[PDB]
Amino acid sequence: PDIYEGSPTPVTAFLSIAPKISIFANILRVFIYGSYGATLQQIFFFCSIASMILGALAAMAQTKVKRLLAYSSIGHVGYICIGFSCGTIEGIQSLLIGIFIYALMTMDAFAIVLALRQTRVKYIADLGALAKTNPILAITFSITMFSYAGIPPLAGFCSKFYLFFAALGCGAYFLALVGVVTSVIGCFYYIRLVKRMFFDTPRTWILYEPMDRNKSLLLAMTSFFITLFLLYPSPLFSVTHQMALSLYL
Amino acid sequence: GSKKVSDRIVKLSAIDPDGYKQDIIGLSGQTLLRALTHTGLIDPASHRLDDIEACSAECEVQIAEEWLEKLPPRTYDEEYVLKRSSRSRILNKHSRLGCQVVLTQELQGMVVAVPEAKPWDI
């Protein structure tokens, strides 16, 4: 969390996405041979449970946007490691789908943060009257927050859904309960942000300057992906199942 | 007569860290941080919002011992914010929060000592 907070926001955007894809690829290509007595499956089991619990219980005590994003990243790392704990094609597929969806949501959220970083946004209360000054950026940020929460209609629900399915496939019922409780806590502290934008009426407002074309296009594309992913999710599942099988043959 | 702005003008003595005493002007009904912002002692870009949750004790002030009894007692949130940012997890027993001190006509001549600045960019 300290590294994420102190790092520059464009830098923090890259470290939150790129170093995870490659490292997860390495961990998979280590599991293909290093499955020695299911030793890593226990380690990743404990790590995933602890990660979900700690992220959920730590992101509720955060007032800054970047620390909350860091703890969200930790929680989603635990949610992905659920897939590691259950070694099966449908577990690795859930892991890869979760990685993809989490990377897209993180890119969306960090583009939103960088859009507001031109006015030096630091606290969640700063984005208080955003629903009045920029009533479409508030909608986009609320969509991203709900996707983090895992609300059914959005794309963030598919990853958690299929990860829980994979966890129940191997028979780890304890993982499912911890995931459910952590999901409830995460959804609470994610809708807390949505409460600030729309429902509060602060005395002092902070006016932000409009973003540029690059971030506007990126936000538009990612927001259309997040809301309309459930309608056509077949290509992602197909490519993910193809990748999971190719790890061995 | 009529309603004058001087009818709610609070005269204060603010000491910046190097020991210089300059007289600042505030409005009764607004936070002491706002009063310090007018002259420029505290950078307005660091504490743009006068709210407890949007604060990391960037408005910390040192109120005089005899001038602290005529103020509301520190709340739990104020103490919690003060302790974390102290860099030593200690309480000065005379340090308040600028955003949580509301000026009043009974605060005429309150002597406040502004500590050194702290980084707030990111």
Partner: peptide, 26 residues
């Protein structure tokens, strides 16, 4: 409603997460 159902409900005593999330700094 206002008593046992609320105290054992989501905010009468389930608001201990404030006394639990804030302790995560340890």
């Amino acid at each position: 409603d206002k008593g046992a159902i609320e105290i054992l409900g989501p905010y009468g005593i389930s608001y201990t997460f404030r006394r639990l999330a804030e302790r995560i700094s340890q």
